Homo-oligomer: A and B are copies of this chain.
Amino acid sequence: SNLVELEATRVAEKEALALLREQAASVGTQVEEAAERILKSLLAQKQEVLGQLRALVEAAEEATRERLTKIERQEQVA
């Protein structure tokens, strides 16, 4: 039956495209998600390291204020 041979062909072409669409949309997906999961760990790197940098500076800023209030007194006695 040619109405069947050809129907067989339509269906198989449709299934071949459907498979291709879902393999493409999966690369789409696999790619959008690697980005999300990279972007996240990355802007988390940043508001972690930026934190521990601001802290290094707070400490240093305290050791350096300690040091000046010591000088400030010994200059009043000088």
Residues in A lying within 8 Å of B, measured CB to CB: 1-3, 6-7, 9-10, 12-14, 16-17, 19-21, 23-24, 26-28, 30-35, 37-39, 41-46, 48-50, 52-53, 55-57, 59-61, 63-64, 66-68, 70-71, 74-75, 78
The A interface is mostly helix, strand or loop, or mixed, namely helix
A45 touching B68 in the complex, CB below 8 Å, given contacts A20-B56, A24-B53, A78-B6: no
A32 to B45, CA, bound (A): 10
Residues of B near A19 (CB, < 8 A) are 59
- From B13, B52, B68, A64 is in contact (CB under 8 Å) with B13
A41 to B39, CA, bound (A): 11
